[PDB]
Symmetry: D4
Subunit: 242 residues, 8 copies
């Protein structure tokens, strides 16, 4: 099967929420992405509704032609929204109310019960769960044990590497983590900080199932337009695999 691309459109909403106006509309962006290389659309419903809103989730759930990947913190509010929304995928992330963006991976190994119940609860509601974690063997083994079918490896450290060596070290760390996760029966994704110049090495990793990318695509889109921004990212991804 081919490498999939999940396009995170949160930042379309962050441009909108800077004013009280309704544009640009994430609902439009999703249609564009889905027709230009996206295999899924991702939204992170933050507790503070900083960008994506309940209104967005609600309409997107009815308009997406592919499937929704709902990113959210593991809280009662979100599990409840998640269960009612029935998104195809749900990606559990850690979240501070005023963090710049998603900081690190979930602390699964240190909250086994909490994650186990959440996975169970989402799974009963027919949602395929993905735990966003660091390329960390302990967290990976834990994710598998709490029952999650997917993990999504945080590519931030790789993305922020300051030197070519630091970068190669993070790459290898991620590739090995991915291999270990698959050996435990997990399906594995990756995301955060992926760009047009750093994505191919990540996409070359065989175990990768889907990459979730947002900011870099939206950043290219304001110059170039979303359609091309997405098509270009999807092109580079398949090139790395061929």
């Amino acid at each position: 099967a081919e490498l999939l691309l999940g396009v995170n459109i949160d930042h379309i909403a962050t441009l909108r929420n800077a004013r009280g106006t309704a544009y640009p509309d994430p609902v439009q962006a999703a249609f564009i992405a889905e027709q230009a290389g996206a295999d899924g659309i991702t939204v992170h419903l933050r507790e503070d509704r900083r960008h994506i809103t309940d209104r967005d989730v609600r309409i997107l759930r009815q308009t997406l032609d592919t499937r929704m990947n709902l990113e959210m913190a593991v809280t009662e509010e979100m599990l409840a929204i998640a269960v009612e929304t029935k998104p195809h995928f749900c990606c559990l992330v850690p979240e501070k109310r005023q963090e710049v963006t998603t900081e690190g991976g979930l602390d699964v190994a240190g909250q086994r019960d909490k994650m186990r119940d959440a996975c169970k609860r989402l799974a009963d509601a027919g949602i395929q769960v993905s735990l966003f974690i660091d390329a960390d063997e302990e967290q990976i083994k834990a994710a598998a044990e709490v029952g999650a079918p997917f993990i999504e490896i945080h590519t931030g450290c790789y993305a922020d590497a300051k030197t070519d060596a630091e970068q190669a070290q993070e790459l290898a760390r991620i590739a090995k983590a991915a291999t270990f996760a698959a050996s435990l029966g997990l399906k594995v994704n990756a995301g955060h900080g992926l760009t047009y110049h750093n994505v191919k090495a990540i996409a070359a990793i065989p175990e990768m199932h889907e990459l979730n990318i947002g900011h870099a695509i939206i950043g290219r889109a304001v110059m170039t337009g979303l359609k091309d921004a997405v098509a270009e990212m999807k092109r580079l991804m398949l090139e790395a695999r061929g």
Copy 2:
């Protein structure tokens, strides 16, 4: 002489600052806009460097092929920077820091002395001053008496009008204010809230020298790309005048 377009690129920076990375870069957005219909580039340096930064102003000042319109609050920090930067145009606006955007016009009539000096100060630097004000005769007479070459009428109320009637009222108000301003020897600009659907009626106002538009252009841009977004806005404006 033709109606001019000033593109505000603040929101390119908004998108960039949502994260710690450097893209999208306001410097790229300016080249694009200048080559697609913009006659000048506007940047608003907020006290809280929310979006546009000193870095941005410093490089932009060296890369713009047209000219800078520096929107700023009337404070000593800003006046010093302006005198220092020598932007072709300077647009004085009220500011609070935690504001969603620039609300209404400047209280010029109520601070004649403070405005009188800033105008003289900036003009001695060879900068052309624009006072962002409400479509209010008291304020226009003030701006005139104080010596500012330009005023920029706030189109916010017109943009937010809730009914067709309310819109029409706000329009006639801006149109009558523009004629009045012109009769006092002021050159008049307009801006804030202008979109692809409400710009023409404002562009048709004879006295209008330049319209400063930002958010609606960036909003169209994440869908179509900055180039077409700017070219479209400019096309609508020239059509209005024709």
Copy 3:
């Protein structure tokens, strides 16, 4: 006051409804059209929901950046839906459950009580009413007398003209009818059967406020794409006025 274009996206749904699938989605078409020259989006909620559905109307009302023009028959059902949806505009038309399309013109002059009540009811909910009528001064006088602020002249006979002379005659007739309409205080729109080759003569009529075009645009769109189809239509319309 620029000639406006209202894009009827009914036929996007005509294509969607031929199968059980959900694409093409009217919601996407609306965003494209509103950004390519459409000043308003029009949908005909038929008694038989052959294309636009309650879902489309419910979501469109939330995603439209411009304004909805709800075409509907005068029935208790429709009037209830309209009062609740609160479209910006509402266009009342004659409906025969099994018709190929709107055959043409409401009999207002013979149902003044019915139309009078409909108009008031919709106006009470804040909806600007448009009575779809033939280029007939008796019908027009009636529309004015019943209180509708708008009328839309049926351009179908003009569109189906079999000879250049028949066409010329229906043009003159539409033109005289529109001038009469305006002298009564009515705002006048026109629609049905307009094409890329017959639209200019109608757009040239000075009294025209908005043209409502659907089928020709969708027919061009499957070939060239909605964006260019809408833009071309709007371009020809503005050329006619110049």
Copy 4:
């Protein structure tokens, strides 16, 4: 031997037939498609001529630069039309006058005499026959036994799969069925319900000769234009094979 694409333009006519007008014209669509990646054009001449008409078939047979694949039910009428038109390919399908679309699969195993005669008759006129069947080895063995050189596996159950597991199962089933088909000397096509997101798994099946896709392409076309819609589909198909 490259995977071929057969573009079914039935739905261009679906849009044309909603009115009395003659556009969009299937004849134009055919030229566009044949020049954008289509290797053959497909039309379904329905008993009720709801879309493609005798005119379309008569003109298409003269304007096609590639080859026609006539989809039709097995009736004396159709067989007579086919013998006279002499399409390069003919695809026999089950037809119920009022169906939404081809429901799926001919019952060949239970009408061997009928199908045997049809196949011979068409082959006598030089037409290469294709029996549209379900991924069913009994039906497939029969198609081979009756003398048809081609079969087209119905991909509808796979397209309408409600769960990833159901989908995976219909894929495996289509795949095993195709391999069995080939071992019998049959050439195997596939069609119905294929989309931009579900086409690769089908295109990857090595035995596949030509995919016949219609609705998804037209649905994308109203948005982006036929040319790009066909090209995108063909591009994804060739990527799956590589």
Copy 5:
């Protein structure tokens, strides 16, 4: 009314007829032209079928969305074909079997009876006749007297002018001829040798109803593509009139 453009597609056929292949097909070119600025499609059925064939006329007559302008010599063969074909317009030209192209205008003043019967015969068959003639008062008066509703002034001499003065003289000669023709009640067209650099002066002439252009459009199309080639010619024409 706006200046119309009749696109002559003969040369699409001349490229085709250089081989025994069927491409490029005039039928495709006509659809493109008609959707890119053409108001009518012109074909010259030559006695030697050098480019356009009976097959072309026959299919075009069924596919054109606008109307056909049949150019032909005044011979029994053509009058008969013309009457059976019932094209909207028929343009009578003089013709040698092996001339490079149409050489000059019809000799109407010297074949009054012949032209009178031909006009009559075509007119009974409901065809609007146009006599292609030189910008010559005697020929123009004659055309009017023999009954033709249209004349088409040969722009060849203007097109071939060797010097700027020779050119200005031909321009004036054509403008005066056009004025004289209109004064006699004739509707007037122009064509032959019109290019992207010489068309505007011709289009600026008020009496001009439709320009018929071929070679230059096809010559640009091989580089640029027909759509743009036509749109560009149509753009220049309307510019000259505004």
Copy 6:
């Protein structure tokens, strides 16, 4: 090494020569093609200067950025011009003057001495010689014995095959001939009649060095423009080899 594309621009001239004007100009068409996938430009100087002229060869020789492939008949006039012009490649073909195009291959086996000298003569000028021949071993052995570096297999019969079977026969014949030619140390090219739909099977033949294609490319060009036409042909060829 990759499969090369040689674009024959003769038919650009065909279109130009249909009239007395200078457009379209082969010189423009060459720049376009060289920048869109062509690795060389081919021009066939016919004795009757039907399309390409001495002017064309003289300027082209100075403007080509890649290299010229001069197709000519084996006559003294031509040999002299070739020796004079110094084209990188020279392709010897049979010619009659009133022929629709180049029919079959050169009779090399039957004129060994004449061909032996032309080859030696041209090679002494530093020109690489290609003998246009039929996929016939007798001719290939002849071309080998005579000293020509290259042979170009005539793909005409393959292009004209009337049935799928006949096509397959012609293909295997060209494929086996190419391998044979290669085994005798000849470099092999192919051409004549290659289209967008039959090129791949020929491109896939391993031994093929360069395919010379003209008419189908010019034919696509009047619709889409030379650039896309060439780029498309080249894309299909590289796909075949991959």
Copy 7:
């Protein structure tokens, strides 16, 4: 009638001559420009052949579809080249210190016999002569006295104005000089330093016959490509006259 644009392609050669290679080729740039809004092509053959070369001139003279405007210094070498070349226009420019004014134009009032001689000589050969001069009444009287039919006003000072005031002044001086020149029977062009942002004010001057623009267009072309850069400039010019 129509304001004309002459594109100076000198800097195409400037980029080519930076190396020993032949690309980019001015011959190609000329075809692009002539089909994108250029009404003529300008090349300045410098004595030192810094950019444009003898071959450029020789070949361009055979490939231009419009006309050549040969720019040259007044020497015997150039007069003989121009006489032999027969360009349509010749623009005499200063190339040495003993030829220019303190501003940049050709010193005509100081070389009256030389110019009188060049003018008469070029004219005998059928070349229309333009004298490149300053917006200077003395030089203009001189040009009129000497026999030149055209003058081309140097817009450099205007283009280099450092302040708005300074710019308005130079504009004025050019406009006045244009009116003055016209009153003496001279046709007048303008050029040097014209850009996308300063051209409209110059285009609006009514007496302007043609604007000669080079560097800004090529400067834009490296980013957007020559076609759009030329088209855009022409569009801006026509907007200025509407």
Copy 8:
């Protein structure tokens, strides 16, 4: 893994410096290239600042989203600039006669102490150093001996080959030199004179890390625009490795 492309934007500055103006601006060309396939940007800061200037370097260092490859001659001025500039890469090149070999590369084997010194010094500052040298074993041993981590092979001879044979020879010599260089622990780049038609053979060499290309891309850009020129070059490179 992926072959990389470094775009040299020197000639953007070459076109700008031909005048006193600031356009075209290298800062813009860099954003375009980095988003169109460039993996790095190269600027050669010449002692004479013929094209790239100090401001270019200073600003580019702050705007590049990828990395800078500073090309410079080995002098104290440049070493200090590079040390202070901290570009990611530095490519040492000959700028004076007493620095080059008879071919074009830097004479390392003849200035071993100087290079050993530059290499060590740049390295201490974190700059990866590349020595631009000939496909010469002696210079390569020297570069290895001296400590440089990279060499960039001069492809000029290969690019200027006058005959196919001559070209195959230089290709071979480059390939051998690449393998040899790699065997000594050096990473290797290539560049100078690479074009759209000669790059694939160089890209196919496995040891190649990055190709540095400038003039051909800018040469193409003036025609097609920088974005497509960069994209096209990158596409050709990747095709070569597939």
